[PDB]
Design a protein around this ligand. Sequence first.
Ligand SMILES: Nc1nc2c(ncn2[C@@H]2O[C@H](COP(=O)(O)OP(=O)(O)CP(=O)(O)O)[C@@H](O)[C@H]2O)c(=O)[nH]1
Ligand SMILES: *C(=O)[C@@H](N)Cc1ccccc1
Lengths: 61, 85, 205, 82, 392
Amino acid sequence: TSYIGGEGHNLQEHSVILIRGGRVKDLPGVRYHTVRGALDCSGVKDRKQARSKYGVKRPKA
Amino acid sequence: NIKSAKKRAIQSEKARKHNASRRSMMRTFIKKVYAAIEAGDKAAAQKAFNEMQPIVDRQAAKGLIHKNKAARHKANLTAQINKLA
Amino acid sequence: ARYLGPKLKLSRREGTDLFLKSGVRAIDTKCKIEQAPGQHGARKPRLSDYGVQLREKQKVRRIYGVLERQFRNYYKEAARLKGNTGENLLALLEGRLDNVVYRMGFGATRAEARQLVSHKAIMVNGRVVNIASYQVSPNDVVSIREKAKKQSRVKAALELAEQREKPTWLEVDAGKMEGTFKRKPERSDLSADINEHLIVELYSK
Amino acid sequence: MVTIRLARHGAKKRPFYQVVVADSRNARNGRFIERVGFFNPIASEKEEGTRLDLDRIAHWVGQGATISDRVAALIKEVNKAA
Amino acid sequence: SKEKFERTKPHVNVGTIGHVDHGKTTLTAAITTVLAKTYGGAARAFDQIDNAPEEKARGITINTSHVEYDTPTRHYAHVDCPGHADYVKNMITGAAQMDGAILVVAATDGPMPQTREHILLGRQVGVPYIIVFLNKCDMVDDEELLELVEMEVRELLSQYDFPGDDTPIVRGSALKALEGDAEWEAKILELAGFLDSYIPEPERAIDKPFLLPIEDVFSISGRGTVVTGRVERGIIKVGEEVEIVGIKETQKSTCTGVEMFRKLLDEGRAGENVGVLLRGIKREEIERGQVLAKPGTIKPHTKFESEVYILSKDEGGRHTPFFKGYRPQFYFRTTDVTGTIELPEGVEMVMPGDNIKMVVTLIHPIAMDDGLRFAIREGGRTVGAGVVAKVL
RNA sequence: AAUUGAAGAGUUUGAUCAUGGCUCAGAUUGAACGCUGGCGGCAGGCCUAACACAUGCAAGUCGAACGGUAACAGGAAGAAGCUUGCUUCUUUGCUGACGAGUGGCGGACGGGUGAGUAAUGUCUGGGAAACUGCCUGAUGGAGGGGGAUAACUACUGGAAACGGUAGCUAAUACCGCAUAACGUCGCAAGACCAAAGAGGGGGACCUUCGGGCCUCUUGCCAUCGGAUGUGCCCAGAUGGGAUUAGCUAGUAGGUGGGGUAACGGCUCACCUAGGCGACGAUCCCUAGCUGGUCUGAGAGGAUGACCAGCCACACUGGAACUGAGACACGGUCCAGACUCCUACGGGAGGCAGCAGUGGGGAAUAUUGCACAAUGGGCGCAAGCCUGAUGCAGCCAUGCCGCGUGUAUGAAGAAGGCCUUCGGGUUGUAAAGUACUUUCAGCGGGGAGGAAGGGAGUAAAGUUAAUACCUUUGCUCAUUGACGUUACCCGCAGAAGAAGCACCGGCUAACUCCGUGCCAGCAGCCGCGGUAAUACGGAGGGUGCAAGCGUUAAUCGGAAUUACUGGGCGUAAAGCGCACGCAGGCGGUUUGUUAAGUCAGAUGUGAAAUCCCCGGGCUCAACCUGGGAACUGCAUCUGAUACUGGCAA
RNA sequence: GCCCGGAUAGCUCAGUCGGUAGAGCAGGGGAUUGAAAAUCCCCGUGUCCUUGGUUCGAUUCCGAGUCCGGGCACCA
Ligand SMILES: Nc1nc2c(ncn2[C@@H]2O[C@H](COP(=O)(O)OP(=O)(O)CP(=O)(O)O)[C@@H](O)[C@H]2O)c(=O)[nH]1
Ligand SMILES: *C(=O)[C@@H](N)Cc1ccccc1
């Protein structure tokens, strides 16, 4: 199982994602994170800070 | 496989039948002496040894035998018959 | 590679007069020195042990305009060379080409001199060199390529060098824009107010 | 068959040949018995570019080490008379 | 790879269009057999074209078949397409290459609701020329039956922006023509003669920036992604890097090979039906409907000005009026995208047969042209026919 | 000249000191991911499916071995038209050359991958029972004949693949005979054993007018060497498991026969009954090994991708042949699996060669150019072949350098944010002004890698010879994939080139607004409950920079495996106690030995890399010279205090 | 290119052969509290995936698109 970081994910039943290492320490049983911005698990919506992680592109404007 | 040097097959495969023919007549003359040893023929084997001495030596010169095998025959086979002689 | 940012803001956080904007206006004066490195630069800094070393390293790098990866390589070299670790570091950082051009007076600021080096203008031993990371060997001479000689920037800047220290280990002819390098740089002859004692210890951890 | 040939070391566009004695049935840089000198082709006019330890070469030539053309011409570059 | 192609003869993007059970597949085998005596030899049979094992029992063109032939005049390429409703999209995207085409009319069939829109699609897809062959000639003893229906046929061309009255109309039987009957065989020989005539030499745009409509991609053994379709604009040489631009996440691809019906072509030009090898591109990062554009030549658009005609219920199209929010599929020569209808103030209810003006925000980007001919289709029948006004 | 080299912090507690884990601060990678992205240089580029593979190419070559000429171009006999020597054309192997074929050499190297293997391997040092094509030295030989065969014809099986039968002819193909020695056998006497000729030039002679003859080049054959490569034996070393403790029956040794190039249970017949094993055998699991790489103060720990040596496999399992050399990547034969063609009778096939394809997968390149250089192959040579190699393309993957401009400039503006609405801050920052043009972009020039070889000539050798042939000069035309080169020059305009993380402490750096145990952050402590520097956004700052961060992975820290360098009364930990085999250690005097020990030297420790001192790429990375070093091992000569040995 | 199933308030599903959409589990908003458990007072919060048609009226009848999953094709 993996924790889904971010604010407003768009997953569903199948939805192919990507995993990276790292536990969350507060959810007993979780040892992995999902990569927002990788495969079918798209990036977080409208973040202007720390967008290397969470996969949000630079602002068009 | 289709290679220009596929001749090396037919060049050697034909050379095999030529090589096996000579290596066979070699070993028949070797077993010719041992039959005399199995009969105790001290002089018949001597002639039989004198019969194949050039036979074991000519094959040694034709690239077939590395002459040491040819030597060990002339070595032990004589040592076989002169021991009884 | 070059910082290309506010060249007087650096003097505020460091709190040291580094001559980044030496030029025409001798004393900067338009920086509100020591009390405005940023917005909340009115506070008093305690500046811990890790803080004093890291500020000591950023003091030297901001002077010579050398970035970390390139600077770490000099510390790498300063270790293997004979003598004194922190002093061999200043032996390397002083023998830099653009550093010599600043010392020879060709260029008001250090960055300006780097541009004279960068644009095939500065020439050493009759061999045009563009790399500012060039290492000046002993018994060498430095000049300017004739196509770029005395064209409104080298002249005014050379006059300004006479309003400063005029270091020991080198001396220019200054009539034909002709420099001359002598014996290796000495720890006493240089700055002597910036310290490398805390720098050697920074890479130690 | 032993042979005295170059080895081609150095870098891209900047070759540096190692005149060395090795076995003919090896690579261009394979197992070699002993190296005897070097030859820098692009050391045109500077301090030093070529050395051939001619005595140890003579030890192998006596054995029958076949010298390659490029190496053979360079023995005539380091002439006994020039 | 097989015989590096020679740039010898002029070419016309020809093909076959019509309606189910007219004989388009069988007659196309006869055309290549009639021309087998003329120059070289094709004679690509009924099984050669309905290649799929399902396509022999199903007997229809559920997936198009392209075979080339060559007259002793110039070079051509024949595109067989269906005339059936549910499989009409195979024909729709395949329709766009046809500068000139062939329409098939059996004597016991005549005009159909599909036959009616196949013609409508033509000019809206970019096919302003159509040769008509009244096939199944040996079906009645009434030669005049062929004569009165042809009156409706020329009028079918007439009603949908085509001066179809001057189109050569030869009458033959392709069943007997392919079986070897020399009597019926000469008819198609006379129709091919009209193609080295009447419908002229096309104005090829090979002197423009490169553009190529994606007909379909293949997965060739040992080669990979072979995007197929004749070049729309300019010339392309093997080694000219471009970017595959359209509906999905566009990216640069280097054209590392092009061939024509497995005939090696070095530097392709606009118009020849050739396949294009794409360097390092998966059979996932590709789609039917996108287009191969020169490096950053045209960025696709969503919102655009549009001038659209809603077909009358009498013309077999949309049979009732509608509300703002209607969702049909917009076809931009190879495109299959559902457009969001946004009709401005002045009109809200558009009845069947209305000359109206409105704009559409598209679900995704696509290669837009300010004058892009396009037919508006809803599943079942052609509901619309218009053109793009301007990119917004 | 040649190790100048070592830092800690958070967290149990009301608080402290301990012990003791957990975590961070650094470096590094064959990396992937997100955002982003100007250039150049140099390296690297399928670690997962040793999974299956389309097409091209990756090994050929010699007419100076020979029979031939099916082609191509000259030539010759002739023929043909007409411009009767202008063209046309059948013959003609007569020359240059060259398919197909015999034959020689190469195909066992190079190139690729790491499945297997815990010893049949590797590293290291020795040893003796070995062979070694091509290269090279010396001594001798190098006579005389014969019978077949492919190519080629005729017929013919078969879809194809592949052939089948009878005649034809050669050879440096094959085979006897002669001849043999420092060769083999044998104590010896004796016995026995080999072969190939070609091409060039030629005065005189000699011509059955093919040639013999003179002479040079080169090859053939034998023995002894050397050099090199390989094979073999022995000692030490060479993963984790004892919850694997006993194992083995050609198994341990002997005798005799056979076998290999070489000794030997390597193989057999019989006999003896051992051998290995707690200083870890058998069995299990994992793994290519090493020089080295990364880290480390060092000792070590992990690891061994690139590069180089060795080993091993070549679709799977197995075998042998030819050959100097293989139990053979682009060889043979068998079987199996998987593919393809088929006329269904039967065949073809092997990318772990470079490219490339599908799939696997977090993930890794072009179906490029050239034999110009280096090397390999054959050949007298010229050359021909070479996906070796040399370069180019692709990717920021890494490392190094450079650039995105310089100086000046106070309405100390605007707009933003804070505010004690006083003001501060952004900030010399921007604009404005004067300058510069690196790299890109466009327009011109321009090194080095190229040495040779060929042609011709000259001279020196050789010889009968001013010829041939070998060597040393000279002259001419030149031989470059890279290459629209490196570099240089010139033109233009501030012109095309700054992001990314973090800001509670650890750890460098701040406030306000919005959200109120929600949303969310997190490497540990932990923040969030209506006034959050820890959430999200804004301004500001800090770090690093064409990279910045995240994840994984090794070392460090970690003296938390303590050899260097820790502990055991209560923190984890003294067998419940005793006797005692193996094993470890041993009081004191003397002698003698010199194995452990030390000193010296020798042999060796491959090169590269690490380190020291220099040279060359404008600099660096990088390349490279010499040296040191390789901490080791073996032998030899001494010392012999200390330990061990034998004796008193 | 094609053929089927899921696309029903947060989640899971019942409801149709036209008749003005539900349930369960959810979670939640107010009174006390430092804040909550607990107790009291009250609760559907829905584009039935989207869009359109056969009409007095469509979750439902018939289509078409997209997305998700699962099967076959086609091979310059
Ligand atoms: N009497 C007659 N029968 C004919 C003639 N031509 C074809 N037929 C038959 O008509 C049938 C339809 O063949 P087909 O070629 O699939 O038609 P199509 O027009 O391609 C149909 P789709 O619209 O799906 O592509 C076959 O049975 C064919 O043999 C003709 O000239 N005369
Ligand atoms: C291959 O034949 C292409 N050159 C032509 C083509 C074939 C099929 C579909 C579309 C184009």
